[PDB]
C-alpha cells in the first residue's frame, strides 16, 4: 500500500538530489563520494543501466520501486544485508554504534535531532548494550 509508497519515496528522495524523479550518475556518484570512496561515471552507469527499463539511463521511480519491492534472481538478499552492515559499521568489528549511525545519516543527508538518533538505535537494539549486531539487524531489515 501507501506506507511502502512513502517509504520508497523517502528512499528515492535520499538519492535524488535535484527533484525531477530521475537519479542520474552525477547524483549517484555524489552519494558514493559523500559516503567515502568515489567511483567514476562509467561505474555508476553500470549500476544504473542494469535496472533501466526505458533505456534513458537515469533510474526512475517505477524502476527504483520495481528493483527494491520485488524479489531478486539469486541469493543476493543475503549480501544486501551484509553490505548494509558494512556501510554502517565503519570499523568492521561487528557492532554498530550511535556515532556510525550518525555518520551514515550525515552522509546520506539527514540532519537528526539527538532524540531521533536515540529513538532509532533503541529500536534496533534488542538486548540493551546500545550496539546493533547482525542478528538485531536481520530482525530490522528483513
Amino acid at each position: 500500500t501507501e506506507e511502502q509508497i512513502a517509504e520508497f519515496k523517502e528512499a528515492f528522495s535520499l538519492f535524488d538530489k535535484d527533484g525531477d524523479g530521475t537519479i542520474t550518475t552525477k547524483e549517484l556518484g555524489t552519494v558514493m563520494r559523500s559516503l567515502g570512496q568515489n567511483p567514476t561515471e562509467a561505474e555508476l552507469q553500470d549500476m544504473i543501466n542494469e535496472v533501466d527499463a526505458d533505456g534513458n539511463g537515469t533510474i526512475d521511480f517505477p524502476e527504483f520501486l520495481t528493483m527494491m519491492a520485488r524479489k531478486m534472481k539469486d541469493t543476493d538478499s543475503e549480501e544486501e544485508i551484509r553490505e548494509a552492515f558494512r556501510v554502517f559499521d565503519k570499523d568492521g568489528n561487528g557492532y554498530i554504534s550511535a556515532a556510525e549511525l550518525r555518520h551514515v545519516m550525515t552522509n546520506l543527508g539527514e540532519k537528526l535531532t539527538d532524540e531521533e538518533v536515540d529513538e532509532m538505535i533503541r529500536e534496533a537494539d534488542i538486548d540493551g548494550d546500545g550496539q546493533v549486531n547482525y542478528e538485531e539487524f536481520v530482525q530490522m531489515m528483513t
Binding site: A6, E10, V31, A84, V87, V104, M141
Partner: peptide, 19 residues
C-alpha cells in the same frame, strides 16, 4: 521505522548493484 527504512531501501540498492 521510517528513518532506518529509507536508508535501508537505499543502502541495499548500493550493495546489490556493486557487489
Amino acid at each position: 521505522r521510517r528513518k532506518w527504512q529509507k536508508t535501508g531501501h537505499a543502502v541495499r540498492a548500493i550493495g546489490r548493484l556493486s557487489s
